[PDB]
Design a protein around this nucleic acid. Sequence first.
DNA 1: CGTACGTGCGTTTAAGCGGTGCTAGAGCTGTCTACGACCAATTGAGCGGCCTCGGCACCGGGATTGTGAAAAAAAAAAGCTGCA
Length: 54
Amino acid sequence: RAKAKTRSSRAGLQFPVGRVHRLLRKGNYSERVGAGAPVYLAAVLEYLTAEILE
DNA sequence: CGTACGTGCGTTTAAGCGGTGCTAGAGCTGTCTACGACCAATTGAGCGGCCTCGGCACCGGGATTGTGAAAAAAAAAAGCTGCA
Ligand SMILES: [Ca+2]
Ligand SMILES: [Ca+2]
Ligand SMILES: [Ca+2]
Ligand SMILES: [Cl-]
């Protein structure tokens, strides 16, 4: 059991896929959230952040 | 003061209409399982709290840049002439 690594690390991301998945669930957007959606969204928020900081 | 626009004609154009004919594809039904919710147990990422030391705010001094006044030139401008 375990030897757990974060969804962020699996997707090659700094931004928290897991936090993003929980905010989509609790943010009243849809009944269900596919497993790709928070990876994609976390990626987009990382890219945009990187661009503004550059 | 100069001419770009508005009006009003005659000539030309293609929108609109009503109709027909063809089928792409919108959208519906039924089936089945891949995927996401839910759960319980596990644990490590990220939280607040705390301490430090180097960036940056602020200062004074000096270098630098830009502005405005006055004087003097360059130039357009204006009023003034006789001719033609
Ligand atoms: Ca004019
Ligand atoms: Ca179809
Ligand atoms: Ca902190
Ligand atoms: Cl998905």
